[PDB]
Amino acid sequence: AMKPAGKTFSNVEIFDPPTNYRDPQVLYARPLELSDGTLLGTWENYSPEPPNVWFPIVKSKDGGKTWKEISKVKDTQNNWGLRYQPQLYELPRAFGKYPKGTVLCSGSSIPSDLSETLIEVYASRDKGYTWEFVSHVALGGEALPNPGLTPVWEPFLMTYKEKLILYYSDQRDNATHSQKLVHQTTTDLKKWSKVVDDTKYADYYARPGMPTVAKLPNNEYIYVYEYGGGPNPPAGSDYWFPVYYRLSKDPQKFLNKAHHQIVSNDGTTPAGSPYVVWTPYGGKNGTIVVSCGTRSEIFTNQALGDASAWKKWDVPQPTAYTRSLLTFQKDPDLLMIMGAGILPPAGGKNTVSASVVRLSEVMKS
Secondary structure (H helix, E strand, C coil), X not given: CXXXXXXXXXXXXXXXXXXXXCCCCEEEXXXXXXCCCCEEEEEEECCCCCCCCCXXXXXXCCCCCCCEEEEEECCCCCCCCEEEEEEEEECCCCECCECCCCEEEEEEECCCCXXXXXXXXXXXXXXXXXXXXXXXXXXXXXXXXXXXXXXXXXXXXXEECCEEEEEEEECCCCCCCCCEEEEEEECCCCCCCCCEEEXXXXXXXXXXXXEEEEECCCCCEEEEEEEXXXXXXXXXXXXXXXXXXXXXXXXXXXXXCCCEECCCCCCCCCECXXXXXXXXXXXXXXXXXXXXXXXXXXXXXXXXXXXXXXXXXXXXXXXXXXXXXXXXXXXXXXXXXXXXCCCCCCXXXXXXXXXXXXXXXXXXX
16 A cells, blocks of 8 residues: 645744744745745744854745755845845846846845844845845844834835835834835846835834735735834733735825725734735635734735725634745645744744645635
8 A cells, every 4th residue: 555645734844943043043934936836935044143144045846845945145245144024036027137037035134233224135046046146225223123213124025017116114214203114116126216105104103014015906006014003002002013004006106095904804903014915816806815923814805905805714824923925826726824933032932834725725715
């Protein structure tokens, strides 16, 4: 007798960090699917230094079932390390001397003392085996989320027409706001535009942050973030980070758009470190899928972001800080959910893991 006769799985471990890693050891998991179906993954790797911290790159050939480390993205520029908030992205077209299919890794280079912040772009021309420094995007100050400091954070990349847009969180322009959501554009991955405001709130202590974006089938885009200092903090809190979003045909123009809090039909209010994707699954409008960093459920919207149409569904992947999502190019029904655990103090227990669910199963088609 031999094994009998798939694609879904739960709580597959990716990395279990050494005991001597620094709290929280790992955090901020990100996945990427390449055009050839290979998956890459990275995270914040709190290794004892030196060497200067790096972003590991793991690779899966079997839809996330098994993984192997194939490289590291190292800081070749600053003698700091690549420390916070990595983000992987595959170019869907050419920008300057970087062709379609080039893999970008963005994130923040930071000295161990957290004294400065610097959002970089690195690129791999061999589907993630080797890396080269591309450009310095945004230099900021001290890497603490305190009012008055001037750090930059949390890069997210997306292409719009002839432009590559890098969205982030920015504390530098702080005469009025302690933190704003902003972006810059490039057409060649070398020269970046002036910084443009995406979202800002008329309270100094508000901290809108952690942008992610997805394209909808009506040619609108959904812009998702956490609204630190958002209204109506729950009993026993003076400050929280409810998940909000905006809709726009032009993803360079979120500032002038009305905001919306995600609240599910049962009154559930997701908060913290959100992540959005859109999949063709679910019919006419597909499905917008959102994760937050404080709940285990997925939040969905099959009405192109109609504030009244958010639903919630249990999945087997645990709650994680900036738990991320990926929708499979060969199969829209398949959703990967990836995390690297909880915020410090994490009690020495964080690991990197993922599950892949079928939406037709999760969401009772």
